[PDB]
Structure formats: C-alpha cells, structure tokens
C-alpha cells in the first residue's frame, strides 16, 4: 500500500517532498498537466513583476544557505525559475493527472482522477493552492488601455499590482472600499535597509500581550494624531476592527498590502531605472498615488450605476471602463468523502494549525495558511516539517491526534476568541505561526537557555524565519550556521530591533504611538516623503512607458479627474498644513557593548532599569500556549 500521496506540486509541497526523500519514505505526487497561474504568466510573458516579500522569507532554507548574499525582493521570474528547478528534480515522482475525488477510510484513502486511474494511499497531503478571482486580470491583462477609469471595491496585493500597471497609462483609479492596511515593505533604520518582516521581534509576545501590542499596532490602528500618517490625511483608509476579540496582536485574520515607498524605490533603483523596471521592479506606492491623486478613496456607498457604468462623485457622473470586484480566494480542494460517503466541509478554524482536519484520517493540508507579512516559504517550510513528523513518527501522530479537538478549541480561544469565522481567518503573523509549529515539533529555542546578551538578541530579535529552526536538531539543514552568521553581520545582530522593545516597556499605547511617529521618517505611510519625489515619479513614468513601448500624451489633461481629486483630498488639504533616533542610537551602543555579557549575573539597579528588564527576559511570564501543553 502506497505510504504517501501528495496532490498538487507547485511551491508549497517542495520542502515536504525533500524530507520524505531524505527518510526514504515511499511517496507518489499527482499534479495537473495544466500547472499554476505562474505557468499562465510565463506562457504569456507576464512574469514582469516582483514579490512583496523578502528573499529570506520567500525561498526555502536549502536554497538560502547556497544563494543568500544580501536582502532583496525576488522577481516573479526568479520565483517561477525556482519552482521549475525543484519541479525538474522531482518530475519522475509526479504523475500528471487531476484528482476529482478522495474517499477517506479508517487508515487509507481512495484517490480518483480525471483519467480514471485510482490510487490507494495511507497518508494524503493536499498542496493544491487557491482559486483567486483576480488571477484573470493579471494573466489576461491589457496594457494598451489608457485614459480609462477603474473602480476597485477591495484593496489587496493583487489590486495594488494591477494599479501599478494602470497608472503609467494615465488610467484613473477609484477605490470604493471599507479601508485597508498598507505597509512600506522596506524601512530605513538609521540609514540602513530593513524589510518590515525583520522588525517584528515576535517572541516579545512572551514578555506580555500589552507590550507586543504597543510594539506593533500603531501603524495599523489609528493611535497617533501625527498629521504626517496616511490614516490621518486620508481617513477613508481606516478599517472597522470591531471584529477583533483576541489579546494576540496583531490578530489572526488581519491582511495588509506591502508596497515600495517611493523613497526606498529611488534608493534601490534610481541608477539603472529602465533596466530595473524591465526586471519587474514596479513602483506600487499607494501612499504616493493618494498624495498625487492618481488614486482616490471614495466612501464605500458612492453612487455607482452598473447599467450605464458611471460613478457619481461630487457633481461629476464619471464613466468607468471596469469595476473590479474583491478578490475571493478558496482552497482548490477536491471532493473529500468522510468514511467514503459524507462530503467534508472545509473551514480554516476547524483544522489544527491550518494543517490537520477533523473527521478525516491521515489527510493533511499544506499551503492554505497565509502569512500577515513575509513570504509563504516561512509557513510552508514549517508546515512541511510538521506533516513529515506526523507521517513518519507514529508517536508524534498519536500525541497531536489524541486531544486534536481540544488543541483546536484552545488555538481558536487564544487567536480568535468569540469572533465568528471570517474569510481571512487563514492569515497569521508569520513569527507566531513558525514559533507555534517549532514548539509543537520540539525544534524551538528555550529562552531560559540564553547565556549571553548575544543569545537574547538571537532569541527575541532575530526573525522567526523557518531556517532559524533548522540550525540544529531533528530538521537541521547544512549551511544554516554560515547563513545566520551572514544575516547577523549584515543587520548588527538585530540590536536596533531589540532596543525598540526596551524603549517602550514603560509607555502606554498612546505614548508608544506618538514615540513611533516622532522620527524624521517613521516606518509606515509617512506622507512627508512624497512631494520631494514628484520629479522622480515623472522620470519613473517616462521610463515605464519606454520599457513597455507606450505613448500617452500628458499634454492632454483630464479636467474632470482634477476636479474629483480636490473633493477626495479635502481632509489632506486641512491636516497636512499642521506638520526617538537619539535614544535608539544610544540604546544600540549600550547593547552592542554588552554583547558577550552573562545575563543571569547582570547587576541590580533608562540605562539601569533596561539592564533589569534584560535579565527578566530569561523568565518570560506569557510563555504558555495551551494548544501545545
């Protein structure tokens, strides 16, 4: 009887197939001849964009140990070439067919296909990805559209990419939405670049809920009155967060757009602009678009007539070329029959860690958990290790399954509380999820085993990327030692991140929010760093058009759009006229000077009490996770 069948092979399945091959576990992969959206994009020459996630969070540990030299954002082309490279390695183990049905019995499943061939396997892993409405827009995208109006009812990474492609042809963009959370994908920390996922120091949640909340939530919740922040200049960007019923911040189910702020875009790409655009580095600064009026926010009930395809805003009845409805995603699951009769109903919250479904035997889901920030790789690498351990170690399988229902209840209580299920329940903070899996598997670090301040930097401030947990022990990957050293030397051992948490231990959330926005350039949505890049933007639009062979006439002027922009930007025209690093810098020198100091022996009695707090980091009081114990 076949031990393992993996259904679907694109990106998510790669690390699981790697571990099954290593333990010489019998497996067969079944995956559709048609492949994925990435194959649609490759075939039509539309791999002309870049990831919204860093190299370190987006490629697997076993590629990073070879290929990491510096932080960067991979291209779509690079992401696809990496899928194809691993597909080539495993192609002989892939049956090209499409699974229509799975009948699940007490200790095996019967797998049915479009060809008619059936398969029996003891363990079945689904790695089939999602159907996304928006994929048609991207794969079938027409660029010879110019001077048209588009209306979006949802703001997401897919909408933000479409918008980046539309604005250069003087398409006007209306967002008729209930607000959105957009975050600079890159931040300058004393003039030195950090991806946003590098600043999250998630294991500080173990110090306290309250402290981590103050550390993370001021750019998401409207907590500062600072008139430089986008959510003060453009309040239609704010969201109803009245659904949140968890002390875990940021909450499971929060989604965010990650985008290039134009100042970082300029820093990376100004010196070879057309070449970088041709590679797929596209400026997607939603905050610059709002600043310049290339995008407008309108209330979610602005008059729209779908029959005449007009939207009416102030006193102009605006013709629109296209309404883009919000991007629903659902797992591509075949029919699953419980005891080979009763349709399984999929619900993220009713699975353990998004991986283990109830009422099914030896079926696992891989790739259906979405990271709040950073790449999918962090999530699917840790899921793969979890699945591999459940499949290959009956002792582990027993330990997790014996109380599966109670684990799932305890997880939902911690992360969702009383909130009713939401379509984005599958979205998790990456650094909580990787750590959660690591503790379930036993490849976690123990904060009490930190000896030096350097060890505390590693435990609390070094990002919880999947490769962090592959340095030693059961799932060690050769070269992770050298990789962690390179990362640490490039980022000063994450001392700046560690110092951030120190600086706010004593503040309330309002003080922390003001303090967070007290910099010359704060991390996220700083509207003071837009006007200075208006000339660079015209250089950019010219370079984009050259790359794409488009002529558009800027000397033709859309007078009715100019009028709608005025109305949309009334709060900005009032708020904007009203427009940390000291401390942080002295914090870093203190910490970098006690790097090799023993923690437990640090003396009693800013500089004095920050030492005591550092000593307490050996015994965090909010460590318990009841879904694991």
Ligand X SMILES: Cc1cc2nc3c(=O)[nH]c(=O)nc-3n(C[C@H](O)[C@H](O)[C@H](O)COP(=O)(O)OP(=O)(O)OC[C@H]3O[C@@H](n4cnc5c(N)ncnc54)[C@H](O)[C@@H]3O)c2cc1C
Q: Which is nearer to ligand X, 79 or 206 (CB)?
A: 79
> In angstroms, what is the minimal distance from the CB of 127 to ligand X?
5
The correct pick among 138, 215, 282, 437 for binding ligand X (CB under 6 A) is: 138
- How far apart CA 150 and CA 206 sit, in angstroms, is 45
Helix, coil or strand: residue 619:
coil
Helix, coil or strand: residue 572:
helix
Neighbours of 110 (CB within 10 A): 16
- How far apart CA 586 and CA 602 sit, in angstroms, is 19
To the question of whether residue 382 is assigned a binding role by annotation, the answer is: no
The correct pick among 35, 179, 227, 235 for binding ligand X (CB under 6 A) is: 35
> In angstroms, what is the minimal distance from the CB of 367 to ligand X?
3
To the question of whether residue 23 is assigned a binding role by annotation, the answer is: no
The correct pick among 5, 10, 159, 467 for binding ligand X (CB under 6 A) is: 10
Q: Give the range of 2-10, 294-302, 388-396, 474-482 binding ligand X by CB under 6 A.
A: 2-10
Instruction: Take residue 324 and report the two structure tokens written for it.
Output: 């883009």
The correct pick among 253, 375, 431, 463 for binding ligand X (CB under 6 A) is: 375
The correct pick among 93, 122, 332, 486 for binding ligand X (CB under 6 A) is: 332
- Give, in order, the Cα–Cα distances in Å from 128 to each of 19, 295, 326: 19, 35, 22
Q: Which is nearer to ligand X, 138 or 512 (CB)?
A: 138
Q: What's the order of all strands across the beta sheet hosting 304-305?
A: 304-305, 310-313, 316-319
To the question of whether residue 61 is assigned a binding role by annotation, the answer is: no
Q: Which residue's Cβ lies closest to ligand X?
A: 10
Q: Which is nearer to ligand X, 11 or 536 (CB)?
A: 11
To the question of whether residue 255 is assigned a binding role by annotation, the answer is: yes
Exposure string for 293-328, b = 16+ CB within 10 A, e = fewer? bbbbbbeeebebeeeeeebebeeeebebeeebebbe
What part of residues 350-369 is at the interface with ligand X (CB under 6 A)?
367
- Structural contact between residues 217 and 223, judged by C-beta atoms closer than 8 angstroms: yes
Q: Please report whether residue 605 would count as binding ligand X according to CB under 6 A.
A: no
- Give a three-class secondary structure readout of 454-522: HHHHHHHHCCCCHHHHHCCCCCCCCCHHHHHHHHHHHCHHHHHHHHHHHHHCCCCHHHHHHHHCCCCCC
Q: Give the range of 48-56, 142-150, 220-228, 607-615 binding ligand X by CB under 6 A.
A: 48-56
The correct pick among 16, 37, 336, 453 for binding ligand X (CB under 6 A) is: 37
Q: Please report whether residue 220 would count as binding ligand X according to CB under 6 A.
A: no
Q: Please report whether residue 391 would count as binding ligand X according to CB under 6 A.
A: no
The owner of tokens 């009026």 is 293
To the question of whether residue 601 is assigned a binding role by annotation, the answer is: no
Cis peptide before 225 (omega within 30 of 0): no
The correct pick among 56, 58, 112, 373 for binding ligand X (CB under 6 A) is: 58
Q: Please report whether residue 121 would count as binding ligand X according to CB under 6 A.
A: no
Label the pairing between strands 149-152 and 322-324. Answer: parallel
The correct pick among 129, 250, 354, 620 for binding ligand X (CB under 6 A) is: 129
The owner of tokens 């981590």 is 212
The correct pick among 202, 261, 334, 447 for binding ligand X (CB under 6 A) is: 334
To the question of whether residue 568 is assigned a binding role by annotation, the answer is: no
To the question of whether residue 588 is assigned a binding role by annotation, the answer is: no
> In angstroms, what is the minimal distance from the CB of 478 to ligand X?
24
Q: Give the range of 121-129, 194-202, 211-219, 495-503 binding ligand X by CB under 6 A.
A: 121-129
- How far apart CA 400 and CA 124 sit, in angstroms, is 17
> In angstroms, what is the minimal distance from the CB of 34 to ligand X?
5
Q: Please report whether residue 128 would count as binding ligand X according to CB under 6 A.
A: yes
Q: Please report whether residue 224 would count as binding ligand X according to CB under 6 A.
A: no
Q: Which is nearer to ligand X, 170 or 380 (CB)?
A: 380
DSSP class per residue in 41-108 = HHHTT---SB-SS-HHHHS-HHHHHHH-SS----BHHHHHHHHHHHHHHHGGGEEE--EEEEEE-SS-
DSSP-assigned beta bridge partners for residue 186? 195
To the question of whether residue 424 is assigned a binding role by annotation, the answer is: yes
Q: Give the range of 122-130, 203-211, 424-432, 590-598 binding ligand X by CB under 6 A.
A: 122-130
Q: Which of 359, 465, 376 is nearest to 426 (CA)?
A: 376
The correct pick among 4, 6, 27, 36 for binding ligand X (CB under 6 A) is: 36
Q: Please report whether residue 99 would count as binding ligand X according to CB under 6 A.
A: yes
Rg (CA), the chain: 25
Q: Please report whether residue 30 would count as binding ligand X according to CB under 6 A.
A: yes
Q: Give the range of 27-35, 261-269, 577-585, 593-601 binding ligand X by CB under 6 A.
A: 27-35
Label the pairing between strands 370-371 and 427-428. Answer: parallel
Helix, coil or strand: residue 251:
coil
Q: Give the range of 32-40, 62-70, 273-281, 464-472 binding ligand X by CB under 6 A.
A: 32-40
The owner of tokens 């306290």 is 208
To the question of whether residue 159 is assigned a binding role by annotation, the answer is: yes
- How far apart CA 371 and CA 374 sit, in angstroms, is 6
To the question of whether residue 370 is assigned a binding role by annotation, the answer is: yes
Q: Binding residues for ligand X, how many (CB under 6 A)?
A: 31
- How far apart CA 423 and CA 330 sit, in angstroms, is 9
Q: Name, in order, each residue with C-beta under 8 angstroms of 507's C-beta and a sequence gap of 6 or more.
A: 214, 515
> In angstroms, what is the minimal distance from the CB of 249 to ligand X?
23
Site residues (CB under 6 A) for ligand X? 7-12, 30-32, 34-38, 51-53, 58, 98-99, 127-129, 132, 135, 138, 332, 334, 367, 375-376
Binding-site residue ranges for Ca(2+)? 481-482
Binding-site residue ranges? 11-12, 35, 38, 52-53, 99, 132, 155, 158-159, 178, 181, 239, 255, 332, 370, 376, 424, 481-482
Binding-site residue ranges for FAD? 11-12, 35, 38, 52-53, 99, 132, 332, 376
Binding-site residue ranges for NADP(+)? 132, 155, 158-159, 178, 181, 239, 255, 370, 424
């Amino acid at each position: 009887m076949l031990e393992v069948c993996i259904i679907g092979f694109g990106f998510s399945a790669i690390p699981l197939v790697r571990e099954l091959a290593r333990t010489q576990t019998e497996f067969q992969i079944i995956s559709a001849e048609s492949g994925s959206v990435w194959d649609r994009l490759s075939e039509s020459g539309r791999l002309d964009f870049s990831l919204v996630s860093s190299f370190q969070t987006s490629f697997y540990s076993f590629d990073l140990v070879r290929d990491y030299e510096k932080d960067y954002y991979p291209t779509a082309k690079q992401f696809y070439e990496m899928h194809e490279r691993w597909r080539s390695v495993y192609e002989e183990k892939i049956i090209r067919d499409f699974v229509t049905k799975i009948e699940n019995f007490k200790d095996y499943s019967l797998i049915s296909t479009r060809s008619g061939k059936t398969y029996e396997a003891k363990h079945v892993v689904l790695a089939t990805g999602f159907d996304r409405l928006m994929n048609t827009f991207l794969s079938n995208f027409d660029n010879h559209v110019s001077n048209k109006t588009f209306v979006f009812d949802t703001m997401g990474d897919s909408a933000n990419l479409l918008i980046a492609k539309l604005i250069p042809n003087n398409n006007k963009i209306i967002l008729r939405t209930n607000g959105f959370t957009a975050l600079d994908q890159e931040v300058q920390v004393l003039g030195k670049p950090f991806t946003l996922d590098q600043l999250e120091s998630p294991n500080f949640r173990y110090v306290s809920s309250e402290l981590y909340d103050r550390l993370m939530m001021s750019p998401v919740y409207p907590r500062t009155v600072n008139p430089a922040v986008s959510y003060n200049q453009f309040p239609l960007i704010r969201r109803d967060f009245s659904w949140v019923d968890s002390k875990s911040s940021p909450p499971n189910g929060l989604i965010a757009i990650k985008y290039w702020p134009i100042d970082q875009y300029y820093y990376h790409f100004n010196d070879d602009l057309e070449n970088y655009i041709s590679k797929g580095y596209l400026l997607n600064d939603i905050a610059m678009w709002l600043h310049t009026g290339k995008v407008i926010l309108v209330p979610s009930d602005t008059p729209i007539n779908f029959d005449k395809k007009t939207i009416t805003y102030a006193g102009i009845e605006r013709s629109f070329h296209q309404y883009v409805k919000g991007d629903a995603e659902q797992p591509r699951l075949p029919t699953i029959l419980i005891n080979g009769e009763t349709p399984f109903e999929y619900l993220y919250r009713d699975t353990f860690m998004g991986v283990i479904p109830q009422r099914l035997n030896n079926i696992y889901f891989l790739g259906y958990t979405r990271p709040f920030t950073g790449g999918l790789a962090n999530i699917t690498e840790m899921q793969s290790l979890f699945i591999h351990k459940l499949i290959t170690q009956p002792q582990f399988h027993q330990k997790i399954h014996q109380n599966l229902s109670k684990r799932i209840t305890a997880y939902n209580q911690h992360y969702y509380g009383a909130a009713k299920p939401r379509k984005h329940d599958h979205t998790v903070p990456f650094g909580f999820y990787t750590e959660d899996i690591a503790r379930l598997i036993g490849i976690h670090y123990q904060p009490n085993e930190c000896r030096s301040v350097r060890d505390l930097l590693f435990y609390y401030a070094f990002p919880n990327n999947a490769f962090k947990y592959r340095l030693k022990g059961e799932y060690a990957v050769d070269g992770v030692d050298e990789l962690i050293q390179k990362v640490n030397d490039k980022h000063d051992h994450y001392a700046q991140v560690f110092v951030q948490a120190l600086s706010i231990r004593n503040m309330n959330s309002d003080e922390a929010a003001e303090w967070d926005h007290s910099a010359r350039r704060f991390s996220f949505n700083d509207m003071r760093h837009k006007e200075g890049y208006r000339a660079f933007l015209d250089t950019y639009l010219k370079a984009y058009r050259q790359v794409e062979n488009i002529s558009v006439d800027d000397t033709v002027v859309d007078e009715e759009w100019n009028f709608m922009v005025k109305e949309a930007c009334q709060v900005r025209d009032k708020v904007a006229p009203n427009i940390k690093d000291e401390d942080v810098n002295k914090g870093i020198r203190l910490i970098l000077s006690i790097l090799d100091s023993d923690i437990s022996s640090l003396p009693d009695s800013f500089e004095a009490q920050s030492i005591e707090f550092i000593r307490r980091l050996l015994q965090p009081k909010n460590y318990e996770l009841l879904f694991i114990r």
